[PDB]
């Protein structure tokens, strides 16, 4: 089979690989729709995942089951499925401790284009079909469903880790796809005021559509000062770090109130470390909790988010700015995420 | 001054009383708009909290500060305020334990028409003004603001105790004002499917307006069976008990899944046993947690809920089906809550 | 093979059943030491979970692995292991929801002598060995290790569900083995005052040994009245329901403070008699949370508990008052639990 | 009156200063026993205090009430009391938000020698006596009681913030007084293995007395490596940072397992900021939660910890290595905390 892989650091291209085979509990799936992610860019041009050879990229996809192992019981060839980017090995001690995302290792739950060929191929492998797949609703637009696989679950997890209270004020730093879902998730957790930080026009409009009551640009001064002016020197209850460099941590700590919570859902791929401003962090005693984690995956997570979409709790269509038709457009779409044109949020390739 | 009070069990009437005076940290407020509650009915006609003599009723109001003690710093005569129904004594060990609703005693945080003269008077007393009042926004309709003082805070608390997860299925038993806010709150906590139980046309319409995806009527069969039918025998993740008799506890336990949560915000009492069905409760080992608590109050809660309204997180105008004017309408409006006509949700009397 | 089973309600006796067969991921284990439980009694003589036929009893055992399936990697023949009484199917949505105890059904995580042949046989079956077994320390007495399988995990779970705070006062209703572990558990969570309820001398000295600061005997007045006198009418922060009839729920509600938590780990007999007292429960608004659940199981739990014992965090030897040898004595031991002598806590049968 | 104050950065000495007077809700207390703290050192020599002039030092004390305001009801002249180092203003929004430690400002709950004259004076002031004092048991040694004021509440808070589970492995970095209580607290939260990091012989013995199952010294290799060796490459569930510099944060992140929790109770008074290692932190998605907070204060906290001591849950005497008699020894005891002789843990001055 043919697949769009990473020939090597800073190098991409199509390669020829043998079709993956399913174990007794797995499934081989063919993509119906896929979407490039900021991670595919990190992994290649930033070596976020060290070096890799002939590895098929991509981890956001909806598709059709074409083959299932003999022990698979809830899925059969022909089924249309939503594939969460995170597909944990459910039989590990990390799962027993309540952290499937790190089953068998840190971030190990995230297999596609991590240490397992991704979805940008004619076919791809899904471990434990019954535990990691969800049926795609009959009338659901492919472009929308693809947003569930990573954008929705990650953004929403940002709001969950933030332990938002009804009426809490929230600042979302970064208004790209993930940050936009962080805003929507924050609203669906009862957030009162929601301040989105970003400037890309199409993103600013989407941020407001999802719930942002205020928008701040870095170009108008220090974000912390801006936030303080909007909150009359009180600061905000919660901060969700969805984009930017390591400097956003320092900003989150400075604008968040003592006893507040900072939730990171941004994948930091550059630099040796992130810095916590001592004074603003109350010298480590201001109860400004710092959290951060990979989006939950698996069947239950996918079905629950899917149902939120079916019940119109969120309109995912506003995330899709570009739609291509044809496997041949994968390279074009991915390169779109690399150059980051100003009118882009997410791109979906419909085979 | 005059005040509409509970002369005794099953006895109402206007009485003459001495105008309360403000202590160093208190405020005397004159009502601008009030609303009768089912709690007033339970307390009077059912004596759900013991006997009372000459106690002015009502605990839902918006008003004008007419006097403050010498130590009050954030409120002054002339300010328009939202008065939360729960006004705790913030200097108590229960507060240090994290339960303001019970400062100095069970339910003692809720004073108005409990053990303190209520708001159905020319003037009423508010303890610790700086900690228990919130400013009324200039453009906010008085009827809507009154819904914050109890309905919104209680309904949302029901959704808070329920510890709802993104996509959780929820059943709200009782779709009166409290249940309606329970529904709205459930949606604002990320609920996917929301099943409302009730039949009054006006309430059914409001339930769907707030987020109900399904409506069930007792006349179509046992509620538990219906819920099992809608869910293909799987039950629901959460249940919020907002209205109905004590038997709804049994229904909640029977329809909720193991590991699920039942949240009570229904002021029980009456004269019917609160029974937990043993088999359905897993003999006490099915992790079906049961919670239930008086709504949070105080300035912070009022300001946070108020801000949600300002940011259009919820439209409270749908709760008000009747608006009257003048003190000489408090009685009629209260009797309306007793007769419970099919066309009533909440009534507000604007003075 | 031979096995002591429940022929049917009120009927017990040795029978010749089929020998369990190990699937690719299971293990066949031969018991080295077992212990009868009150649960066996409820199940047989009370049909608390439903009638059964020729079901081998017992769910508390330590044993030797004699056979493992072809896919088992961490255990092999010859290994001595601690078998937790709760062995969940780890590949289920309940597990994905965070409740292994109810994998594939309410209480379905607890298989042995629930709907699967128990440990009172020449050999027994353990589903998914790699996920449900733990190595037995070389120097750990068999009698002590058997206490980890259910008594320790259940008692500690009551303490966990109780959400005890540093200094919290706690009442443990019932000082049988489960309550004793509830007491030890409470101390190990930071409890200050710990009031144990019971009268058997042997249990009384064990309770104090585990941390009880006060012991209440029924013959000195009703338990609620005693606790209220000991606490000057203030009640206690937490209540763990370990033993007794269904009236203990009401007693727990009556002595727990507003905002308190009731933790049930008592497998309840029959009826529904789980009545909640309206007034003491603040009409459902006193924030008196009621929790209750089946003990956690699986490999991780058994290893974590095992390590607590190895590090002397709790001395399990005080739970064993009777030790017998040989399969023959399984019947004698079990009947001992039915008669509930005053000198018994737990009995262990070493094969 | 006389008081041992800070005459200026890196300057100490006795001074004459006005004796405080009690507000209507305050009390004036005369010290019975006091103890110098590492904070007194940072404040005077590290200037993390933002510098001050003629400020009386000390915040750890037990004493006698000699005067109360007209509105004080639960404490009267002659009462012996435990004074928590943290004495918040209980009437504030931060308290309503659940964070007394920061009422009216970040760390504002800590008043003594922060922005209010400390306890090293003939008399000192306590705001809101009824909410901020606890009665000192008649038979409790003054030296032990003083350890409750900060060491115990802080160390225990580290264990509380760590949200420890029964059997969790815990590493405590720093075995000075605070870390010693972090170890005791961890044990009292059900920790299995507890690894203490320190080298001072007197502290190492104390560490083992309170529950340390292992002791690691920096002089034997990278602490993370040493921990991995003990844990066979799996790391630990929890880490409590109780001593050392900002490098402990990096070590904490590296040794804790994904999904683990890092609890900081160490006052960081040097450096521009603390650094989080990007890779070890899973690029911000390893669910390695970071917490850090000032110890709780107030009457409830003090009574609850006090009762734990009364019920022998922890023996505080092992923290007191030096005992002096006489006000004139405060300077000597304080300098002891500066020079840090090897046989020191905590010094108490009994007036
Ligand atoms: Zn992605
Ligand atoms: Zn009301
Ligand atoms: Zn048992
Ligand atoms: Zn100190």
Can you give the three-state secondary structure of B176-228, one letter per residue? CHHHHHHHHHHHCCCCCCEEEECCCHHHHHHHHHHCCCEEECHHHCCHHHHHH
Distance to chain B for A192, nearest Cα, Å: 5
User: C284 and C302: one domain?
Assistant: no
Contact in structure between C38 and C57 (CB atoms under 8 Å): no
CA–CA separation, B74 vs B133, rounded Å? 9
- Compute the residue count for chain B: 351
DSSP A136: P
User: B169 and B46: one domain?
Assistant: no
Cα atoms found within 13 Å of the Cα of residue D92, Cβ hemisphere only: 16
User: D39 and D139: one domain?
Assistant: yes
Coil vs helix vs strand at C2 = strand
Considering CB atoms only, which of A97, A268, A283 is closest to D283? A268
Contact in structure between D194 and D172 (CB atoms under 8 Å): yes
Q: Report how far ligand 1's centroid is from the alpha carbon of A125 (Å).
A: 17
Instruction: Count how many domains chain D has.
Output: 2
Coil vs helix vs strand at B129 = helix
User: In sequence order, what are the residues at sequence separation of 6 or more whose Cβ sits closer than 8 angstroms to the Cβ of residue B196?
Assistant: B171, B172, B175, B179, B183, B204, B207, B208, B212, B214, B215, B216
Cβ distance B166 to A160 less than 8 Å, yes or no, reads yes
Contact in structure between C104 and C87 (CB atoms under 8 Å): no
Distance to chain D for B215, nearest Cα, Å: 36
Contact in structure between A38 and A68 (CB atoms under 8 Å): no
Contact in structure between C126 and C29 (CB atoms under 8 Å): yes
Dihedral of CA C97/C102/C105/C108: which sign?
A: positive
Neighbours of chain C (3+ CB pairs under 8 A): A, B, D
User: In sequence order, what are the residues at sequence separation of 6 or more whose Cβ sits closer than 8 angstroms to the Cβ of residue A50?
Assistant: none
Tell me the DSSP string of D176-197: SHHHHHHHHHHHTTT-S-EEEE
Residues B312-328: b if buried by 16+ CB within 10 A, e if exposed: ebbebebbbbbbeeebe
Q: Report how far ligand 1's centroid is from the alpha carbon of A57 (Å).
A: 11
Closest by CA position to D161, among listed D146, D172, D148? D172
Instruction: Give me A237's structure tokens.
Output: 């209850």
Strand order in the sheet with B194-197: B214-216, B194-197, B170-173, B236-241, B256-264, B289-292, C289-292, C256-264, C236-241, C170-173, C194-197, C214-216
Cβ distance D93 to B300 less than 8 Å, yes or no, reads yes
Using CA atoms, how far residue D185 sits from A63, D201, D210, D271, D279, in Å, is: 51, 21, 9, 29, 30
Coil vs helix vs strand at C141 = coil
Final residue of a structural domain among D252, D271, D292: D292
DSSP C7: E
Structural domain of residue C225, as residue ranges? 155-292
Q: Report how far ligand 4's centroid is from the alpha carbon of D327 (Å).
A: 18
DSSP D71: T
CA–CA separation, C80 vs C133, rounded Å? 10
Q: Report how far ligand 2's centroid is from the alpha carbon of B337 (Å).
A: 11
Using CA atoms, how far residue B163 sits from A164, B186, B191, D66, in Å, is: 11, 9, 10, 48
Final residue of a structural domain among C254, C277, C292: C292
Which residues on B lie below 8 Å from A166 (Cβ)?
Answer: 156, 159-160, 185, 188, 304-305, 308
Contact in structure between D231 and D169 (CB atoms under 8 Å): yes
Which CATH number characterizes residue D207's domain? 3.40.50.720
Cα three-residue angle A43-A49-A52, rounded to 5 degrees: 85
Cβ distance D303 to C167 less than 8 Å, yes or no, reads yes
Cβ distance B128 to D91 less than 8 Å, yes or no, reads yes
Cβ distance B299 to D128 less than 8 Å, yes or no, reads no
Which of B88, B93, B96, B103 to probe by mutation at the D interface, max D CB count within 10 Å? B96
Dihedral of CA B236/B242/B245/B249: which sign?
A: positive
Cβ distance A107 to D288 less than 8 Å, yes or no, reads no
CA–CA separation, D129 vs C82, rounded Å? 54
Which residues on B lie below 8 Å from D130 (Cβ)?
Answer: 91
Closest ligand by atom to B58 CA: 2
Q: Which residue of A has its CA nearest to B154?
A: A166
Considering CB atoms only, which of B94, B97, B289 is closest to C291? B289
Cα three-residue angle A249-A254-A257, rounded to 5 degrees: 115
Cα atoms found within 13 Å of the Cα of residue D250, Cβ hemisphere only: 16
Q: Report how far ligand 1's centroid is from the alpha carbon of A110 (Å).
A: 10
Cβ distance A266 to D284 less than 8 Å, yes or no, reads yes
Contact in structure between B188 and B182 (CB atoms under 8 Å): no
Residue ranges in chain B assigned as alpha helix (H): 38-41, 93-96, 129-132, 142-146, 153-161, 177-187, 201-210, 223-230, 248-255, 298-310, 330-339
CA–CA separation, B281 vs C102, rounded Å? 13
Q: Which residue of C has its CA nearest to A298?
A: C96
Tell me the DSSP string of C202-242: HHHHHHHHHT-SEEE-TBTB-HHHHHHHHTTT--EEEEEE-
CA–CA separation, B94 vs B99, rounded Å? 5
Which CATH number characterizes residue C314's domain? 3.90.180.10
Contact in structure between B189 and B159 (CB atoms under 8 Å): yes
Which of B287, B289, B291, B297 to probe by mutation at the C interface, max C CB count within 10 Å? B287
Closest ligand by atom to C150 CA: 3
User: C273 and C307: one domain?
Assistant: no
CA–CA separation, C206 vs C178, rounded Å? 12
Instruction: Give me B213's structure tokens.
Output: 């995806």
Binding-site residues of A for NADP(+) sit at 175-178, 198-200, 218, 265-267, 340
CA–CA separation, C200 vs C342, rounded Å? 5
CA–CA separation, B335 vs C32, rounded Å? 73
Which residues on B lie below 8 Å from C106 (Cβ)?
Answer: 258, 282, 286
Contact in structure between B160 and B186 (CB atoms under 8 Å): no
Resolution of the experimental structure, in angstroms? 2.2
Which residues on C lie below 8 Å from A95 (Cβ)?
Answer: 90, 95
Instruction: State the count of interchain CB pairs (< 8 A) between B and D.
Output: 34
CA–CA separation, B106 vs B99, rounded Å? 10
Ion ligand 1 residue ranges (Cβ < 5 Å)? A 37, 39, 150
Contact in structure between B277 and B255 (CB atoms under 8 Å): no
Rounded to the nearest 5°, which phi and psi values hold at C195? -100, 115
Q: Which residue of D has its CA nearest to C156?
A: D166
CA–CA separation, C85 vs A133, rounded Å? 31
User: C245 and C322: one domain?
Assistant: no
3-state SS track over B262-284: EEECCCCCCCCCEEECCCCCHHH
Q: Report how far ligand 3's centroid is from the alpha carbon of C10 (Å).
A: 19
Q: For chain D, first and last CA: distance in Å?
A: 15
Residues from D contacting C (CB-CB < 8 Å) are: 156, 160, 165-169, 185, 187-193, 213, 303-308, 310-311, 313
Instruction: Give me B340's structure tokens.
Output: 């419970």
Contact in structure between A213 and A236 (CB atoms under 8 Å): no
Cα atoms found within 13 Å of the Cα of residue D322, Cβ hemisphere only: 22
User: C205 and C253: one domain?
Assistant: yes
User: C116 and C175: one domain?
Assistant: no
Q: Report how far ligand 2's centroid is from the alpha carbon of B37 (Å).
A: 4
Contact in structure between B276 and B247 (CB atoms under 8 Å): no
Q: Which residue of A has its CA nearest to D277?
A: A273
Q: What technique was this entry resolved by?
A: X-ray
Closest by CA position to A239, among listed A148, A319, A163, A345? A163
Q: What is the dihedral of CA C220, C223, C228, C231, to 10 degrees?
A: 80
CA–CA separation, D320 vs D328, rounded Å? 19
Rounded to the nearest 5°, which phi and psi values hold at A188? -80, 10
Strand partners for C323? C348
Closest ligand by atom to A34 CA: 1
Binding-site residues of B for Zn(2+) sit at 37, 59-60, 150
Contact in structure between B131 and D91 (CB atoms under 8 Å): yes
Contact in structure between B17 and B1 (CB atoms under 8 Å): yes
User: A192 and A240: one domain?
Assistant: yes
User: C134 and C169: one domain?
Assistant: no
Q: What share of chain B is helix, strand, coil (3-state, %, to 5)?
A: 30, 25, 40
Distance to chain C for A131, nearest Cα, Å: 7
User: C304 and C272: one domain?
Assistant: no
Instruction: Give me B208's structure tokens.
Output: 């769907």
Strand partners for D29? D65, D124
Which of A284, A288, A289 to probe by mutation at the D interface, max D CB count within 10 Å? A284
Burial class (CB in 10 A: 0-12, 13-18, 19+), D219: exposed
Burial class (CB in 10 A: 0-12, 13-18, 19+), A201: exposed
Distance to chain D for A234, nearest Cα, Å: 10
Q: Report how far ligand 2's centroid is from the alpha carbon of B211 (Å).
A: 22
Closest by CA position to B29, among listed B73, B71, B75? B75
Closest by CA position to D186, among listed D204, D208, D211? D211
Coil vs helix vs strand at C84 = coil
User: D150 and D31: one domain?
Assistant: yes
Cβ distance A90 to C93 less than 8 Å, yes or no, reads no
CA–CA separation, A299 vs C96, rounded Å? 8
Instruction: Give me B212's structure tokens.
Output: 């109900």
Instruction: Give chain A's count of helices (H) and strands (E).
Output: 11, 17
CA–CA separation, B119 vs B176, rounded Å? 22
Residue C128 labeled ligand binder? no
Which of B162, B164, B166 to probe by mutation at the A interface, max A CB count within 10 Å? B166
Which of B73, B95, B104 to probe by mutation at the D interface, max D CB count within 10 Å? B95
Phi-psi region of D93 (alpha: psi -120 to 50; beta: other; left: phi over 0): alpha
Considering CB atoms only, which of C90, C93, C130 is closest to A95? C90
Tell me the DSSP string of C47-60: -SS---SSEE----
User: A66 and A162: one domain?
Assistant: no
DSSP element (H, E) containing D331: helix D330-339
Closest by CA position to C96, among listed A296, B53, D98, D45? A296
Distance to chain C for D257, nearest Cα, Å: 15
């Amino acid at each position: 089979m043919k697949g769009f892989a990473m020939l090597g650091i800073n190098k991409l291209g199509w390669i020829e690989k043998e079709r993956p085979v399913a174990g007794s509990y797995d499934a081989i799936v063919r993509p119906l729709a896929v979407s490039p992610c900021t991670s595919d860019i990190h992994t290649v041009f930033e070596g976020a995942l060290g070096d890799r050879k002939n590895m098929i990229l991509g981890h956001e996809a909806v598709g059709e089951v074409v083959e299932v192992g003999s022990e698979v019981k809830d899925f059969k060839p022909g089924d249309r499925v939503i594939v969460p980017c995170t597909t944990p090995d459910w039989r590990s001690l990390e799962v027993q401790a309540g952290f499937p995302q790190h089953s068998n290792g840190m971030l190990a739950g995230w297999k596609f284009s991590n240490f397992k060929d991704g979805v940008f191929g004619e076919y791809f492998h899904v471990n434990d079909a019954d535990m990691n797949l969800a049926i795609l609703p009959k009338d659901m637009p492919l472009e929308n469903a693809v947003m569930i696989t990573d954008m929705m679950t990650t953004g929403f997890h940002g709001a969950e880790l933030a332990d938002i209270q009804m009426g809490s004020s929230v600042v979302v730093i970064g208004i790209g796809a993930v940050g936009l879902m962080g805003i929507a998730g924050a609203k669906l957790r009862g957030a009162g005021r929601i301040i989105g930080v970003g400037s890309r026009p199409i993103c600013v409009e989407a941020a407001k559509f999802y719930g942002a009551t205020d928008i701040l640009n870095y170009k108008n001064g220090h974000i912390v000062d801006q936030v303080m002016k909007l909150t009359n020197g009180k600061g905000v209850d919660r901060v969700i770090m969805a984009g930017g460099g390591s400097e956003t941590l320092s900003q989150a700590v400075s604008m968040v109130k003592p006893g507040g919570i900072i939730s990171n859902i941004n994948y930091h791929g550059s630099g040796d470390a992130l810095l916590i401003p001592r004074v603003e962090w109350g010298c480590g005693m201001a109860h400004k909790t710092i959290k951060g984690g990979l989006c939950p995956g698996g069947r239950l997570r996918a079905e629950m988010l899917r149902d939120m979409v079916v019940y119109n709790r969120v309109d995912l269509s506003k995330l899709v700015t570009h739609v291509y038709h044809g496997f041949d457009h994968i390279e074009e779409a991915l390169l779109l995420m690399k150059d980051k044109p100003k009118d882009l949020i997410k791109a979906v390739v419909i085979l």
